[PDB]
């Protein structure tokens, strides 16, 4: 069980570091990734606390969990400051990009976050702050 | 955002640096960071210091790595009126190779290759080697007793043309050509804040003759004393400016010609030096098209150096030194 716990905790830590290395496409996506990792860490803490196996590793896991919480939550909410623009009726990708940013070449950016055909994106469009 | 840099002595994102100068170069093994911190002192409250003399830093330039390696020194100054400044200096992680002293037990590498002698002259201080040139074989490699970890490498990569410098990650790059990665066509009238081209004639040479001796096993007499010679020529200089740069290991025909061409590229690359100062702050080996018609440049040049400078008042400029279009 020490073998298994070492593997699981190292995998959770390095998967957190992997999530942090890439940008969140949607607030719900970043929060779901954080939910996955926090669930794994809480499971490991409950295991390391079951009948006072080791109290110390329980406390250590708890501290690393609060750290991964602060970082993953800041990444999901604040790395790009995603806002939901409200457009009257659905509109093209180029027109939406040009009206939001003043730069239509940024239309590629509106496709990774919004689902909807390129000629009809909206009428609510997730994008970055301006 | 114009924001180029964000320095980390370990995670502490410098927000007080009053100025900065970051230099990268191919003519040498390292770089030179130079930060300027404020460091106030209230002579009643408690004060805290940082005695780093070795605590590791990096300079992410314009959202991208530029340097990797306050190891250099701390230089806390004083004055009455503008005092309390702290100049930190930070060389490149490939430094101890520069300031150490070889401590390999044997001293006599037998039937080895230059790559291997370089791998064991570096892995004593944990500097991963980015070997990207070739494997040359050599019978006798005796290191002068405690010479220097950098002199010996420079000697072993000069007699077989191999540029030895440092990348942005923190590794030692032993290359033979360029880093590819072409870029901005600097045109006179477009971004050059200032330029200075100088193609002199006191540092060129028509014929370079490399002589030496054969150090193989069994080879003696004439075949090791007489034959080894080579005469490479640069059909661009002009009149007979001869030379003779002698060789210092296992003088093969290829070895001779190769040391010859190495120096024939050094002297070449020094005979057209183009220093340009551009505006805002990736070119340590990059080639660019440059157009300066008044001095007749319409050619593709390689940046040998790269210096980012800053100072909150009037700066943010980059100084490039380029490589000739023979």
């Amino acid at each position: 069980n020490a073998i298994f716990t070492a593997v699981r905790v190292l995998s959770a830590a390095y998967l957190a570091k992997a999530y942090t290395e890439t940008a969140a496409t949607t607030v719900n996506e970043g929060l779901t990734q954080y939910d996955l990792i926090a669930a794994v860490l809480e499971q490991e803490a409950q295991i390391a606390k079951d009948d006072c196996h080791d109290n110390e590793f329980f406390l250590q896991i708890r501290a690393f969990a609060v750290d991964v919480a602060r970082v993953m939550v800041n990444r999901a909410y604040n790395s790009p400051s995603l806002i939901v623009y409200a457009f009257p009726g659905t509109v093209h990708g180029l027109v939406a990009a040009w009206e939001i940013f003043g730069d239509a070449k940024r239309s590629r950016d509106l496709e990774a976050r919004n689902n909807g055909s390129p000629w009809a994106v909206g009428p609510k469009i997730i994008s970055e702050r301006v | 955002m114009i924001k180029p840099m964000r320095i980390f002595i370990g995670g502490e994102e410098l927000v007080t640096y009053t100025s900065a100068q970051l230099q990268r170069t191919k003519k040498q093994m390292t770089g030179s960071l130079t930060v300027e911190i404020f460091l106030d002192y209230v002579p009643t409250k408690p004060t805290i210091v940082n005695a780093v003399r070795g605590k590791e830093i990096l300079v992410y330039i314009m959202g991208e790595l530029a340097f990797t390696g306050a190891g250099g020194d701390v230089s806390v100054n004083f004055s009455k009126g503008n005092g309390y400044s702290v100049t930190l200096t930070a060389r490149g992680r490939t430094k101890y190779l520069i300031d150490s002293s070889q401590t390999h037990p044997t001293g006599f590498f037998k039937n080895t290759s230059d790559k291997k002698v370089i791998e064991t002259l570096v892995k004593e201080h944990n500097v991963v080697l980015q070997w990207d040139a070739e494997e040359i074989d050599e019978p006798k490699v005796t290191l002068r007793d405690g010479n220097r970890i950098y002199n010996e490498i420079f000697e072993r990569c000069n007699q077989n043309c191999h540029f030895a410098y440092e990348t942005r990650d923190g590794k030692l790059l032993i290359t033979d050509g360029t880093n590819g990665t072409v870029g901005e066509d600097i045109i006179l009238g477009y971004n050059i804040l200032d330029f200075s081209a100088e193609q002199s004639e006191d540092q060129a040479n028509s014929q370079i003759t490399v002589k030496g001796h054969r150090t193989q096993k069994g080879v003696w007499g004439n075949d090791a004393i007489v034959q080894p010679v080579q005469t490479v020529a640069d059909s661009w200089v002009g009149a007979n400016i001869p030379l003779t740069i002698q060789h210092y290991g296992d003088a093969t025909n290829e070895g001779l010609q190769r040391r010859a061409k190495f120096e024939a590229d050094r002297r070449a690359a020094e005979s057209k030096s183009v220093s340009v100062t551009v505006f805002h702050v990736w070119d340590i080996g990059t080639v660019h098209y440059v157009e300066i018609p008044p001095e007749g440049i319409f050619d593709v040049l390689e940046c040998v150096s790269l210096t980012y400078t800053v100072d909150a008042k009037s700066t943010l400029e980059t100084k490039l030194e380029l490589a000739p279009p023979p």
Partner: protein, 48 residues
């Protein structure tokens, strides 16, 4: 070893992060709001 009294500011950072993530869905702790006082009180309890 490796288990001792946390830094004060470190302790309140941890408590604010735990209150923001497990309760407020990730919202920041705006100063001078009721969540600010609740977080401060808790800290105070932990440090006592």
């Amino acid at each position: 070893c490796t288990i001792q009294r946390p830094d004060p500011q470190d302790l309140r950072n941890d408590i604010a992060t735990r209150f923001s993530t497990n309760v407020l869905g990730g919202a920041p702790i705006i100063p001078e709001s009721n969540e600010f006082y609740v977080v401060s009180l808790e800290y105070a309890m932990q440090e006592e």
